Design a protein around this ligand. Structure first.
Ligand SMILES: C=C(C)CCOP(=O)(O)OP(=O)(O)O
Ligand SMILES: C=C(C)CCOP(=O)(O)OP(=O)(O)O
Ligand SMILES: C=C(C)CCOP(=O)(O)OP(=O)(O)O
Ligand SMILES: [Mg+2]
Ligand SMILES: [Mg+2]
Ligand SMILES: [Mg+2]
Ligand SMILES: [Mg+2]
Lengths: 316, 307
């Protein structure tokens, strides 16, 4: 009966959770926190707020939600991408293991969700805040799904430029739109800045893909080891199909499929994209055109310190 | 000019997502759907609705939300537990890879969350369903994190029977309580009696202890993957704390060594089992523990837990 009394007191109570248990399972998350770039995701929110005007207490919460979602996404992305480093540091799953990292990352998504309720007391608004959160996280998982599928089942599907851009609108545009849509919904205060935040996500991503190869040609071109269907690689694959460069098209697939860390093999692929397909110049120029679409936006049809961010978008 | 036009169209529209795309991402999930148990998790929902009386359309969505969370939880748990099999079938991550499986599973978490807003249009009630959904998924992750922590840090921390039971209230109680708390908040029924959460908690507990018990018993009588996983099973927690108390130092260490082996070796697995069989009598202890738990419900004449 002391057993039953114990079982009885157990089931008539909320589940026990100590602050100690909380520390033990937050290890993978505390590790990625030791990484920079933070002050920048914070500079973008701060700038957009000059327009949205939410009180600083609400802006702090919007910011905590996004940081939890962002860092958790990277903890996961690194398992998904077999990444050994993130922001010059050893990846969490390599230290604590994939099991703990996945669980903790998923855990933080729900803490993030929890915080949405500290943004309002109003039910109509709260319901909309949750829908935005739910929607963009659904979008993030969709693009991430395609990026991962194209790569892992290559050459089953060779994405075209169009397909890549759609994948990026979901994948990368997910959190960008999330942050902005929350702010536009909490604003006490012109046209929606969503097309502009979308163009930013796109630029951010093609730039991430591009710089990952160009800095090795001049990091470690880890994208090649991953086998990622990046902007430069998507152009090269399609370009070779179109110009009938069979041998080169196949060599590109062969190298991607090696998941190689050999610097010379990676450098060969890059030099193929440089001189054979001209995928690097194409990408650098595609980036510039997108940036000009904003820099030449006088009539403010995209646009509402703003541009300073566009050139330091790599540090977010 | 034409490139700028295309980008303009793109950024002014919602992200494009086709049904073929939906089919691609769904592959790891669909693969697990070829699995039984469904006419039983759904059986419990049915039964309890006899007291809750939710209108079918609403009950089905609950059934849907529960199914997505459960199947998704299993996809991830198998990755976390390095499980090669689930219901006799090759686990999803061994077929589609860990990357796609993790992504798909999480996606389904959010799809499940989406179904929550289609349970009701009343803004007060909806908020409660979300808080419910949110709270239990958090407990689920807390328990899972602890079950994984003990295992992966062994032998840093060896839980006591009590710590184990608390871990289970979180991990396994989560989905059980989420299912019932939703149904109770939706119930059109005036006063369907005392809340059934205490009863669903005891159920969750019996369920997990029995799961750990059966993993070893169906191997002592004839794969015992919990040993290969190195899991702090209910019988294992009992054996470890039983040898520590009876000062049986060498048996205590032998148990730890085998769990730390992460072994698939039949002989060695048989060896750990014979220790629990003859040395600590942990399997008989577990069987009896389960029976006591059940008797709490069987001899519930004043219906304190039962409806
Ligand atoms: C969930 C998101 C948006 C992260 C995607 O990152 P990528 O795998 O595309 O590249 P890195 O962020 O690791 O540079
Ligand atoms: C959460 C635990 C311990 C078991 C999960 O699987 P079930 O016992 O519910 O069985 P199936 O859903 O896989 O049929
Ligand atoms: C997320 C939950 C609740 C499933 C936990 O199942 P276990 O980790 O106990 O392992 P299985 O025996 O169910 O495979
Ligand atoms: Mg990555
Ligand atoms: Mg990635
Ligand atoms: Mg398991
Ligand atoms: Mg498990």
């Amino acid at each position: 009966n002391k057993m039953e009394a114990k079982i009885d007191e157990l089931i008539n109570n909320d589940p026990v959770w100590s602050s100690q248990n909380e520390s033990l399972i937050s290890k993978p998350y505390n590790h990625i926190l030791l990484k920079p770039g933070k002050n920048f995701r914070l500079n973008l929110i701060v700038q957009i707020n000059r327009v949205m005007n939410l009180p600083k207490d609400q802006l702090a919460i919007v910011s905590q939600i996004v940081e939890l979602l962002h860092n958790s996404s990277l903890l996961i992305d690194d398992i998904e991408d077999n990444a050994p480093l993130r922001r010059g540091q050893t990846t969490s799953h390599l230290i604590f293991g994939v099991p703990s990292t996945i669980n903790t990352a998923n855990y933080m998504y729900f803490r993030a969700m929890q915080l949405v309720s500290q943004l309002t007391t109003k039910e109509p608004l709260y319901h909309n805040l949750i829908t935005i959160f739910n929607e963009e996280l659904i979008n993030l998982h969709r693009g991430q799904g395609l990026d991962i599928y194209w790569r892992d089942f290559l050459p089953e599907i060779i994405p075209t430029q169009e397909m890549y851009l759609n994948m990026v609108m979901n994948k990368t545009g997910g959190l960008f739109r999330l942050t902005l849509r929350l702010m536009e919904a909490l604003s006490p205060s012109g046209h929606s800045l969503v097309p502009f935040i979308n163009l930013l996500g796109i630029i951010y991503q093609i730039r991430d893909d591009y710089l990952n190869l160009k800095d090795f040609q001049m990091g470690f071109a880890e994208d090649i080891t991953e086998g990622k269907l990046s902007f430069p690689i998507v152009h090269a694959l399609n370009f070779t199909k179109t110009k009938g460069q069979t041998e080169q098209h196949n060599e590109i697939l062969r190298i991607l499929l090696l998941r190689t860390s050999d610097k010379d093999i990676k450098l060969k692929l890059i030099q193929i994209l440089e001189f054979d397909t001209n995928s690097l110049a194409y990408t650098k120029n595609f980036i510039n055109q997108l940036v000009n679409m904003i820099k030449n936006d006088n009539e403010n049809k995209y646009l509402p310190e703003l541009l300073y961010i566009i050139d330091h978008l790599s540090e977010l």
